[PDB]
Amino acid sequence: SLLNSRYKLVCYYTNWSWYRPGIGKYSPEDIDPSLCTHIVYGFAVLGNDGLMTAHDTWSDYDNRFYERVVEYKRYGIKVSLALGGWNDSAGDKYSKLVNDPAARAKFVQHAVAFLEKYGFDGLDLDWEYPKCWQVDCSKGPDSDKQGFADLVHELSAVLKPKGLLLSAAVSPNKMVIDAGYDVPVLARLLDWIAVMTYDYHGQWDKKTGHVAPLYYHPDDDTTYFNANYTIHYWMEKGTPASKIVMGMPMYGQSFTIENRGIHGLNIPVSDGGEPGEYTRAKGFLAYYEICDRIRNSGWTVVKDPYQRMGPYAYKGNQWVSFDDVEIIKKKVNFIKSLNLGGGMIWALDLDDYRNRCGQGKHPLLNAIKTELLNPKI
Ligand SMILES: CC(=O)N[C@@H]1[C@@H](O)[C@H](O[C@@H]2O[C@H](CO)[C@@H](O[C@@H]3O[C@H](CO)[C@@H](O[C@@H]4O[C@H](CO)[C@@H](O[C@@H]5O[C@H](CO)[C@@H](O[C@@H]6O[C@H](CO)[C@@H](O[C@@H]7O[C@H](CO)[C@@H](O)[C@H](O)[C@H]7NC(C)=O)[C@H](O)[C@H]6NC(C)=O)[C@H](O)[C@H]5NC(C)=O)[C@H](O)[C@H]4NC(C)=O)[C@H](O)[C@H]3NC(C)=O)[C@H](O)[C@H]2NC(C)=O)[C@@H](CO)O[C@H]1O
Ligand SMILES: *[C@@H]1O[C@H](CO)[C@@H](O)[C@H](O)[C@H]1NC(C)=O
């Protein structure tokens, strides 16, 4: 059992995975409580009044999704509420919050009251990101860095005496870490730091690449866009290994390549991949969408034999990179070799939780659990 091991397994739950057809539908009651130590609810958002509020009142309040996920505290799981996420981070509203001490002070007392109203064990900060709003470092003032660290302090100072948790999901990008994160404050005050060691590559690159390389690979354009560098950078900036939980994607980045004859790594790309039937977003595919394309639509799989990264798969002008059970066992032995706090997945509902592909229910997340519980490194 994961609850009696030295590792965390932090699972993100997403309230919008309810709005999916057929087998893609995911509800609170689909959470498998033997697969996580911590569940993080994505996402609450920052309202116009500068206070945390439900992103989707229909599901969160009227259909009691908050209460239905906080349910799993009954199995010994810690359930936190995440604030922010990519789409809530598009503007300046978090920056206006953290640069204003009176707004932070109001925000903080209300936030803790919100968490306790619904029974949450903690808060997860997912502002993407201080200074580099949606990764654009020219957007935010440098004082976002100190503002966010002061927010984290002011949150910790009220949460910690109550026994409540404070964590954050943070960029894997060297440039964002340098510009927006006061790493020693974060490392000292957070119960864990969920490093989002994925989305290194995607349609924005105008070229094919892997969503989540583990190690540097010789054809890479940078030495720093891989989990191994990102994890060592966080520790080098001052993070104790035990605070790091390493992010792993349950989904793939998809691309439309510019001609179907070329189909390897780093080949030109005109757009994101075609949207999946269930996730309905150009540019990505859930693992259960990918594994079905491979098993039944004849997509070809190319594994990396050096095992610096997971596979990619292509058909015609469609190309997707993703993690398979093999690279995940490698990532988890890596987690164990560095004595990291544990692993994190984005997200429960993107793994093959219905066993649509014949490898078992939740093949990726079971692979993580099994490797985390295996004593050999
Ligand atoms: C260009 C240049 O000059 N420089 C480049 C750099 O750009 C480049 O850096 C890269 O830059 C890209 C951005 O272009 C970054 O990509 C971002 O990476 C982040 C990770 O650090 C991602 O954020 C985290 O992880 C996940 C993704 O894995 C995030 O998930 C996303 O979350 C949002 C919510 O915030 C989800 O949005 C939900 O979307 C669905 C639609 O799909 C909505 O669904 C609808 O719901 C309503 C009701 O609610 C319903 O009625 C509708 O029917 C329904 N519709 C459908 C179709 O279903 C939801 O409502 C909505 N939810 C909310 C709350 O709004 C989104 O789907 C989800 N995506 C996935 C795949 O799950 C999550 O927020 C983050 N948190 C955590 C804990 O994981 C971010 O996703 C990603 N952005 C994009 C655009 O992909 C790269 O990180 C960055 N890389 C690096 C290394 O920095 C660099 C490097 O390449 O190079 C420079 O030079
Ligand atoms: C991982 O990173 C560290 C420091 O950046 C480096 O010393 C080590 O050799 C890297 N491992 C691989 C396999 O690239």
DSSP 134-199: TTBTTTS-THHHHHHHHHHHHHHHHHTTTT-EEEEEE---HHHHHHH--HHHHHHH-SEEEE----
Residue 123: give the domain boundaries. 2-249+323-373
Residue 287 within a domain: no
235 lines ligand 1 (CB under 6 A): no
Residue 343, H or E segment: strand 342-346
- In sequence order, what E strands does 64-164 have? 78-84, 122-126
Asked if residues 209 and 173 have their Cβ atoms less than 8 Å apart, the reply is: no
Assign residue 106 the CATH number of its domain.
3.20.20.80
Instruction: State the sign of the Cα–Cα–Cα–Cα dihedral 92, 95, 99, 102.
Output: positive
Asked if residues 345 and 23 have their Cβ atoms less than 8 Å apart, the reply is: no
216 lines ligand 2 (CB under 6 A): yes
Residue 284 within a domain: no
266 φψ region: left (φ > 0), alpha (ψ -120 to 50), beta (else): left
Residue 146, H or E segment: helix 143-159
Asked if residues 249 and 284 have their Cβ atoms less than 8 Å apart, the reply is: no
Burial class (CB in 10 A: 0-12, 13-18, 19+), 122: buried
198 φψ region: left (φ > 0), alpha (ψ -120 to 50), beta (else): beta
Alpha-carbon distance of 366 to 314, in angstroms, equals: 25
Residue 268 within a domain: no
Q: Under 8 Å CB-to-CB from 174, ≥6 apart: which residues?
A: 224, 229, 230, 233
Residue 95 within a domain: yes
In 3D, which of 335, 340, 341, 346 has the Cα closest to residue 371? Answer: 335
Residue 279 within a domain: no
Quote the ligand 1 centre to 204 CA distance (angstroms): 12
Strands 318-321 and 251-257: antiparallel
Burial class (CB in 10 A: 0-12, 13-18, 19+), 131: buried
For residue 227, give the ligand nearest its CA. 2
236 lines ligand 2 (CB under 6 A): no
Strands 8-14 and 342-346: parallel
- Judged by DSSP in three states, 358 sits in coil
Residue 270 within a domain: no
Residue 243 within a domain: yes
Q: What is the resolution of this structure in A?
A: 2.2
- Based on the structure, what is the number of domains in the chain? 1
Given the structure tokens 């925000």, which residue do they identify?
A: 107
DSSP per-residue string spanning 20-41: --GGG---GGG--TTS-SEEEE
The encoded tokens of residue 83 equal 């604030």
Residue 170 within a domain: yes
Asked if residues 346 and 36 have their Cβ atoms less than 8 Å apart, the reply is: no
Asked if residues 348 and 31 have their Cβ atoms less than 8 Å apart, the reply is: yes
CA-closest residue to ligand 1 atom 3: 136
- Please name the method used to determine this structure: X-ray
The encoded tokens of residue 129 equal 């990101």
**CA distances (Å), origin 270, targets 8, 202, 235:** 39, 11, 37
Q: Quick count: other Cβ atoms within 10 Å of Cβ 3?
A: 13
Strands 312-315 and 318-321: antiparallel
205 lines ligand 1 (CB under 6 A): yes
For residue 15, give the ligand nearest its CA. 1
CA 55 to chain CA centroid, nearest Å: 18
